[PDB]
Amino acid sequence: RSFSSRTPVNRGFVTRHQVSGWRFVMRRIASGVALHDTRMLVDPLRTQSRAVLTGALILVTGLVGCFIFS
Amino acid sequence: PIVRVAVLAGGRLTEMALPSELPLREILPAVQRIVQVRLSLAPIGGAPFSLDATLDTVGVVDGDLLALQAVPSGPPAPRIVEDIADAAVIFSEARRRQWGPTHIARGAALALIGLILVGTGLSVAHRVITGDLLGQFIVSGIALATVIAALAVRNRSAVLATSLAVTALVPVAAAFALGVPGDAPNVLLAAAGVAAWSLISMAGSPDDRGIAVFTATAVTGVGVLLVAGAASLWVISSDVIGCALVLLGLIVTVQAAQLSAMWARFPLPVIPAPGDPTPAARPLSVLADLPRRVRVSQAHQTGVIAAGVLLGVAGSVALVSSANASPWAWYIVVAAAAGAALRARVWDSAACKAWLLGHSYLLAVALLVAFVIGDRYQAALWALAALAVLVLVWIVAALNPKIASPLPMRRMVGFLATGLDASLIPVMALLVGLFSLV
Amino acid sequence: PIVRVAVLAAGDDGGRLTEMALPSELPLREILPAVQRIVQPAPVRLSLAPIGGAPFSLDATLDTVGVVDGDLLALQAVPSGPPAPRIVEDIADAAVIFSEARRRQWGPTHIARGAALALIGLILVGTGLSVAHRVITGDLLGQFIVSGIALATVIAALAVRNRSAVLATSLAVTALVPVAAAFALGVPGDFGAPNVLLAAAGVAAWSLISMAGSPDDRGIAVFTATAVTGVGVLLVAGAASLWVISSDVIGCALVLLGLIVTVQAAQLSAMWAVLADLPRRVRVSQAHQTGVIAAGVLLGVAGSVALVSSANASPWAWYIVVAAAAGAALRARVWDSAACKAWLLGHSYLLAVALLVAFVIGDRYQAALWALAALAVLVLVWIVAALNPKIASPDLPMRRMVGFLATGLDASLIPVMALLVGLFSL
Amino acid sequence: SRLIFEHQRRLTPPTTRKGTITIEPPPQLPRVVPPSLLRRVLPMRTEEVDAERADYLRYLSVVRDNVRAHAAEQRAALEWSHPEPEVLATIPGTRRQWERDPRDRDFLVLRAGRHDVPLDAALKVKDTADEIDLEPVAHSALRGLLDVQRTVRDAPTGLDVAKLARITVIGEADEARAAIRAWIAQAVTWHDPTMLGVALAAPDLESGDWSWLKWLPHVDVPNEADGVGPARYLTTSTAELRERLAPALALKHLLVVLDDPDADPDDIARLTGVTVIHRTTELPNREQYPDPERPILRVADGRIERWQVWQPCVDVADAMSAAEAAHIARRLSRWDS
Amino acid sequence: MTARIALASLFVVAAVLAQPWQTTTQRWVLGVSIAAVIVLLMFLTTRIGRALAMVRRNRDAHRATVVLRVDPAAPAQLPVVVGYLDRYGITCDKVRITHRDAGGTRRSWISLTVDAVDNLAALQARSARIPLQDTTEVVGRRLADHLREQGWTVTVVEGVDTPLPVVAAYRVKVLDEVLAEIPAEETWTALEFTGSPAEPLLTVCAAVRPLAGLTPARGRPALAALNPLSTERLDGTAVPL
């Protein structure tokens, strides 16, 4: 059918899984010293940070949209 | 019928084997001969025996610790006892010591803190108001003496050390501000001095006392440095300093716990590769230090939130307080204040919630003192009225514990709390004129 | 070779205190069954302990660890068992578990402290704003807003008296800043002579109103201190406003009032207030003593500033400020408590600080550096007295010499008061 | 004479749930793709695998709490049945002195220190994946769980003297006798004189070092008088001790401790309970596969290192002094049973 | 005596600034200053105040005492009674040994005074109320048991005696010759130890119904404090033994 990731028994480069898992751990620690629950059903810190990031995105979008209206 | 006991006589107890059912008038000379006035065998803390009663009459069993002592002069001394009921105030009369030498140390420490504060204030007023180079020399001398005092006593006291290091950053921040002549471009060096001294004294610290006063001054000094750098080199108005300061407060208030857990130096995750990692486990020497690092993380988080509030009021008082600025500034001020009040529904420590809910109070007080120091005296009464509404909405939530007890309503409150900091930075683009420059 | 002690066994119901004759020169594991036989039935392994200290380990006898014949020994436990620290390796669970020593619940009891602190801050900053409006412009809204919020905080500190008694006393304490600002801005003129009389009268009247209607302690020392201070400034401004011109007899009059109410503090505090509720009355009388001594220090600093603030200061005044400072510092040895000693020792510190403030405000900047030098000398002798402990067994006839110096130096400034005010040269 | 003892039934100890605690295996590293850039410009992502990671770490926190409850229950049972050797001076007067009946799971086991016992629960994770890669954080967290919570921390430990039949102790002569006195006091406090006995052989014994064994009711034989006390077993030679020990060995246990490093160690055997605790001079070289019986325990400064090949086996030992064991044995001479 | 040094220095500095002694304005003040410095010099005005207070006299429950009548008194029982100034956490303020030589039979009393302010919270543990008298009787019973044990006999009494007629209560300067020599038909002698029995400090008063080194007491409280049931301090400064 398919081939799952298998390694039999007998350098350094960050994969996508290591980066995503590191960011999940760093969003579990920072939701452990802030919310004092590590269940991570919801996480409001990511909501605040993505709110500020979409604010910067709306700034960049309006700036480019005024650059084509210039 | 033999009872073997230990008889105390220089207090070396021997081991004897007395006969039980004989009167003590014949046992006592042999005991005085073996071990060493009418002497008699008494139990410890008791009366001596009747000298003609046998040992299996009084009730001596194998293993008692008798003692040779003289018979008293007739009374039994019946060992009175007074029942007491509140003994915890006796021990509390022993911990509550008198004047002693442990009060002179606290008095001299408080007197030294008062010396450094008064010597900063007078010798700043001797340079700001009028005077020659004599004024700033005292500030620099007090600053360098207090730095070497707070760095020399870190191993002897560690409580007077952190107190001298907290007190040290008012003559440090005053020594570099009016040290260089000129004017402002002088808050760059003062912000650098208070940030550098707050980062030096955060190195050799215990678990607490690297609390909010150090990392809040560090993040506040770094933010004021990164804002005043854009004013020292370029030329920007008050509508850029306030925007950059409020934006910096929003940035390091939102990204506060990530920055805390990065700055706490936790035992970093050992997330492995999909190849052949087989990584070593965390040893038990670094796992037992963890309840110290959690407290350091909590103190750093409280300080980062407090520095974000101090920066978000430090530029909020520079956007609109000059003279009748644009209503985009009067929106950004209320937007940062209501945002820092809405973030208090997120956190769970009490000091972070207090510093976030006190941002509106600090904003009203700072706008009041900036309307007074700017000589307006008409919007100052309105800032006092806004402070009155703030104290009223504190009181209504306090004495009536139904309003302060939190399913679509909370979702709408969260939607407002995300809409405010989503719409802040576009209004920051409207305000400075960065849309109009393109 | 026995010693007679009395052991205390407060474990069962209240406690038992029993005198006994324990044999010295015998290790304590041999005589603790005797104590546990006498005092307990008339288990962690219990040991004798001095009250206010570590328990005696059972290796040492009563002689080698030093109990004087007649001591009071408690029956404590062996000092601790070996504690087991919790150990977790998931750092998020270590952040939620090891930070539970935080009392981190918000609750409806942090909002009460926040609301009380917010109300106190609002009262203080409204007073500050409207005074700063009044003392730099000319308006009838300064008196209006101050007399509004002062009446508001008096009514809101009298009517909450039988509801909290912690917000009531603290609100009445912070209410005498707007009362002091509301009474001092009536009949404006050019700030006058009797504006300080009206302010001191209002402060003393409100302090006596709130002290005679006070339930208990925690807020008697501040009210007694500001009451005696207000009555003293009232009795000086009564001469400075009604009697004569009072050029600089105000300073000697205030230092005389401070000296009288400091050396006679016991008689004033006795004048202030079958086995009774004496644990309350002792605390009340001690608070009254601390208040009267604090008022003496404050009146001494006030007159000591009013003498030598201005230029061409007479050298009798510069003697008498130092003599009052050294007398009030040498009166620390006669008072038993800690706060009275602290006020009498810090009178000189408060004098140096207030003289520095009075030289900055008076726009001199030439003797304010000398005020900083005197403050540096005072904190230097504080640091020298704190570093190596010299308690007052030295420093038996030398204590009599210090007592003679303190009797003379408290008496040497009484003729200099009459010499400075021109009473002798009439 | 003496007092009397009656066999009051034992108090109920906190029951240990030594069963099997199974953990579900970690997920099998689901493969996400790079986000296919038109999907990145449009507004199994990382959100699905992060929600699955959070579900597995919630389950792992639940089973970590259950394992910590198992460990606290086991340490409560071990601290109830092996107290620190200052608590056992309040024991021998109470109703909990002669308690260890031979049907118990802790009978004739003698406390010796405080080290990491291996948590008798199973802690078995069920896997059938033939070398499949697992999810990296969800496998790293279980790999951190299965070695930190797998062992209890410092907990009261015991020499199982029911099945040792000899003990060899090496060390300095007044810090090894502290350990011998400590676990022989643990032996003489808990078990009745109809269950164990204590003998001794020493050349300089009546000198405050081993004299505290006068008062014990265990050291007596049945039916001798000897003047002062019945027989006391406190002899000086070694074969002469065995001549005194003739009817007692031929099941009442014994702890026939021998103190002299010379003079024929283990002359009694080579039995079935005569655990002759002998102390010697120096360590062997390549001693022949150190048995589950007859071991060799060097008493260090604070550790009791078992001779294995130094595998210290006890992190912090307990050291009862001379007068402390004198107070133990003097408060115990009243009761006979 | 700071107020009298103050007024004496006031009159002396009034004399010193009165140098031009002319037309009797700066001569009357010189005469007043040399006539008022001799009445303030301070050991004479206290005699006038005590005489006026005697003319005024001619027109508690915070300190509780226990008394014990010891018949065969001795100096060797003075240690076990002087240790009760601070022992068993009760800190009695004063310990008084009073002999009465009325006739020939010397009657000896022992008085212990427990305060309630000096050991306020040492009594607040006994009950929610303060049992002052109930613990002063406990200290009295403990001293009675201790003194009856060591050989003497002691009995608690409550109606003790009359030290003054309802006569001459001198004070001594602190010793053994005066206490063995101090006539009339009734003589009283009282030693009073106070202050931390590692180094106690005593006063001694003595009444009769000047011998060698006595001092008469002008102006009575010193008689009314001399009964063993007094809660007072036998006024006069104390020497360190």
DSSP per-residue letters across C320-389: HHHHHHHHHHHGGGG--SHHHHHHHHHHHHHHHHHHHHHHHHTT--SSHHHHHHHHHHHHHHHHHHHHTT
State the best of D142, D216, D228 to mutate against chain B, taking most chain B CBs within 10 Å: D228
- Mark yes or no for CB contact A38/D57 under 8 Å: yes
Give B350's contacts in chain C (Cβ within 8 Å).
102-106, 110
Residue of D nearest to C26 (CA): D323
C-E CB pairs within 8 A amount to: 70
Other CB atoms within a 10 A radius of the CB of residue A45 amount to: 20
Specify the 3-state DSSP secondary structure of A5.
coil
CA B47 to each of CA B74, B281, C62, C371: distance values in angstroms, whole numbers, following the listed order: 11, 66, 20, 72
Order of strands, sheet of E201-208, starting from the edge strand that comes earlier in the sequence? E154-157, E64-70, E107-114, E94-100, E187-194, E201-208, E168-172, E214-215
* Chain A nearest C-alpha distance from B355 (Å): 14
Where do the H-state alpha helices sit in B77-129?
88-95, 102-128
Residue type, B426: P
Q: Which two tokens stand for residue C332?
A: 């620390």
Q: Which residue shows structure tokens 């230092």?
A: C255
How many residues comprise chain A? 70
Q: Which residues does B305 contact at the CB level (< 8 Å), separation at least 6?
A: B253, B256, B347, B352, B355, B356
Among candidates D58, D133, D137 on the partner chain, residue whose Cβ is nearest the Cβ of A24: D137
Nearest to E75 by CA among E108, E48, E105: E108
Order of strands, sheet of B65-70, starting from the edge strand that comes earlier in the sequence? B16-19, B2-8, B65-70, B39-43
State the best of C414, C416, C417, C423 to mutate against chain E, taking most chain E CBs within 10 Å: C414
Q: Which residues does D141 contact at the CB level (< 8 Å), separation at least 6?
A: C90, D56, D57, D60
Instruction: Please give the residue range of the domain that contains residue A65.
Output: 1-70
Say if A and B touch: at least 3 Cβ pairs within 8 Å: yes
Residue E21 located in a structural domain: yes
Among candidates D49, D130, D136 on the partner chain, residue whose Cβ is nearest the Cβ of A18: D136
Say if A and C touch: at least 3 Cβ pairs within 8 Å: yes
Is the distance from CB of D31 to CB of A5 less than 8 angstroms? Answer: yes
At what angle are helices B238-254 and B409-432 packed, to 10 degrees?
150
- Mark yes or no for CB contact C114/B349 under 8 Å: no
- Nearest-angstrom CA–CA distance, B195 and B200: 9
Nearest to C171 by CA among C119, C127, C213, C132: C119
> For the purposes of burial, counting CB atoms within 10 Å of the CB of B382, is it exposed (0-12), middle (13-18) or buried (19 or more)?
middle
Q: Which helix (H) or strand (E) holds E171?
A: strand E168-172
State the best of B5, B56, B60, B62 to mutate against chain D, taking most chain D CBs within 10 Å: B62
- Nearest-angstrom CA–CA distance, B138 and C365: 13
> For the purposes of burial, counting CB atoms within 10 Å of the CB of E207, is it exposed (0-12), middle (13-18) or buried (19 or more)?
buried
- Mark yes or no for CB contact C425/E17 under 8 Å: yes
Asked if residue E144 and residue E50 are part of one domain, the reply reads no
Nearest to B346 by CA among B401, B296, B417: B417
Is the distance from CB of A31 to CB of B257 less than 8 angstroms? Answer: yes
Is the distance from CB of D315 to CB of D115 less than 8 angstroms? Answer: yes
Residue of C nearest to A33 (CA): C95
Other CB atoms within a 10 A radius of the CB of residue B65 amount to: 20
Where do the H-state alpha helices sit in C159-244?
167-174, 178-182, 195-212, 221-238
Give A21's contacts in chain D (Cβ within 8 Å).
53, 135-137
Specify the 3-state DSSP secondary structure of B231.
helix
- Nearest-angstrom CA–CA distance, A60 and A56: 6
- Cα atoms found within 13 Å of the Cα of residue B46, Cβ hemisphere only: 21
Nearest to A3 by CA among C196, D29, B275: D29
What residues of D are in the C interface, CB distance below 8 Å? 57, 60-61, 64, 68, 75, 84, 86-87, 89-90, 94, 114, 141, 144-145, 148-149, 153-154, 321, 323-324, 327, 331
- Nearest-angstrom CA–CA distance, D211 and D205: 6
Q: Which two tokens stand for residue C207?
A: 């302090």
Is the distance from CB of C76 to CB of C11 less than 8 angstroms? Answer: no
DSSP state of C241: I
Report yes or no: B403 at the C interface, CB cutoff 8 Å: no
Maximal C-alpha separation, chain E: 83
Asked if residue E174 and residue E116 are part of one domain, the reply reads yes
Residue type, C298: L
Residue type, B387: L
Asked if residue E203 and residue E114 are part of one domain, the reply reads yes
- Nearest-angstrom CA–CA distance, C332 and C206: 30
> For the purposes of burial, counting CB atoms within 10 Å of the CB of C61, is it exposed (0-12), middle (13-18) or buried (19 or more)?
buried
DSSP state of E112: E
Give A59's contacts in chain B (Cβ within 8 Å).
425-426, 428-429
Q: Which residue shows structure tokens 């978000």?
A: B312
- Mark yes or no for CB contact B45/C38 under 8 Å: yes
Asked if residue E212 and residue E94 are part of one domain, the reply reads yes
- The matching CATH number, chosen from 3.10.20.90, 2.40.340.10, 3.30.465.10, 3.40.50.2300, for C2-77 is 3.10.20.90
Measured in whole angstroms, the distance separating CA C356 from the mean position of its chain's CA atoms is 23
- Mark yes or no for CB contact A45/B298 under 8 Å: no
Structural resolution in Å: 3.7
* Chain C nearest C-alpha distance from A21 (Å): 14
Other CB atoms within a 10 A radius of the CB of residue D229 amount to: 20
Report yes or no: C91 at the A interface, CB cutoff 8 Å: yes
Binding partners of B (≥3 Cβ pairs within 8 A): A, C, D, E
Q: Which residue shows structure tokens 């550096």?
A: C369
Say if D and E touch: at least 3 Cβ pairs within 8 Å: no
- Nearest-angstrom CA–CA distance, B287 and E97: 69
Q: Which two tokens stand for residue C19?
A: 């005198």
Torsion-angle region of D8 (φ positive above 0: left; ψ -120 to 50: alpha; else: beta):
beta
Asked if residue E68 and residue E41 are part of one domain, the reply reads no
Q: Which two tokens stand for residue D95?
A: 């109703």
Other CB atoms within a 10 A radius of the CB of residue D141 amount to: 26
- Mark yes or no for CB contact B99/C17 under 8 Å: no
- Nearest-angstrom CA–CA distance, E81 and E228: 14
Cα angle value B18/B21/B23 (rounded, 5°): 85
Order of strands, sheet of D304-306, starting from the edge strand that comes earlier in the sequence? D234-235, D196-201, D253-258, D276-280, D166-170, D296-299, D304-306
Binding partners of D (≥3 Cβ pairs within 8 A): A, B, C
Is the distance from CB of B177 to CB of B190 less than 8 angstroms? Answer: yes
Q: Which residue shows structure tokens 């004013």?
A: B231
What letters, b where the CB count within 10 A reaches 16 and e where it falls short, cover B211-226? bbbbbbbbbbbbbbbe
Is the distance from CB of C219 to CB of C172 less than 8 angstroms? Answer: yes
Other CB atoms within a 10 A radius of the CB of residue E34 amount to: 12
CA B359 to each of CA B228, B309, B313: distance values in angstroms, whole numbers, following the listed order: 22, 6, 7
* Chain A nearest C-alpha distance from D57 (Å): 8
Q: Catalogue the E-assigned strands of chain D.
A: 22-23, 109-116, 124-125, 154-160, 166-170, 196-201, 234-235, 253-258, 276-280, 296-299, 304-306, 316-317
A-D CB pairs within 8 A amount to: 46
- Mark yes or no for CB contact A33/C95 under 8 Å: yes
Nearest to D161 by CA among D109, D237, D216: D109
Q: How many helices (H) and strands (E) does chain B have?
A: 19, 5
CA B93 to each of CA B98, E122, E131, E210: distance values in angstroms, whole numbers, following the listed order: 10, 8, 18, 47
The per-residue DSSP string of B257-307 comes to HHHHHHHTT-----PPPSSS--PPPPPHHHHSSHHHHHHHHHHHHHHHHHH
Where do the H-state alpha helices sit in chain D?
38-41, 46-81, 136-148, 177-190, 239-244, 322-330
Is the distance from CB of D190 to CB of D302 less than 8 angstroms? Answer: no
Residue of C nearest to B389 (CA): C122
Where do the H-state alpha helices sit in D161-267?
177-190, 239-244
How many residues comprise chain E? 241
- Nearest-angstrom CA–CA distance, A37 and A44: 12
Q: Which helix (H) or strand (E) holds D32?
A: none
- Nearest-angstrom CA–CA distance, C371 and C377: 10
Sign of CA pseudo-dihedral C386, C389, C393, C395: negative
Q: Which two tokens stand for residue E229?
A: 């049931």
Cα angle value B326/B330/B331 (rounded, 5°): 110
Cα angle value C322/C328/C334 (rounded, 5°): 150
Is the distance from CB of B267 to CB of B294 less than 8 angstroms? Answer: no
> For the purposes of burial, counting CB atoms within 10 Å of the CB of C335, is it exposed (0-12), middle (13-18) or buried (19 or more)?
buried
At what angle are helices B238-254 and B212-232 packed, to 10 degrees?
140
Report yes or no: B357 at the C interface, CB cutoff 8 Å: yes
Among candidates E126, E141, E149 on the partner chain, residue whose Cβ is nearest the Cβ of B72: E149
Q: Which two tokens stand for residue C326?
A: 């050294």
- Nearest-angstrom CA–CA distance, E99 and E97: 7
Residue E237 located in a structural domain: no
Other CB atoms within a 10 A radius of the CB of residue C385 amount to: 18
Q: What method was applied to determine this entry?
A: cryo-EM
Instruction: Please give the residue range of the domain that contains residue E89.
Output: 64-224
Q: What are phi and psi of D277, to 5 degrees?
A: -75, 100
The number of distinct structural domains making up chain A is: 1
- Mark yes or no for CB contact D324/C58 under 8 Å: yes
- Nearest-angstrom CA–CA distance, C333 and C319: 23
Q: Which residues does D20 contact at the CB level (< 8 Å), separation at least 6?
A: D121, D122, D124
Is the distance from CB of B16 to CB of B34 less than 8 angstroms? Answer: yes
Q: Which two tokens stand for residue A58?
A: 């709306």
The per-residue DSSP string of C19-76 comes to EEEEESSSBTTTTHHHHHHHTS-----EEEEESSSPPPPTTSBTTTTT--TT-EEEEE
DSSP state of E239: B
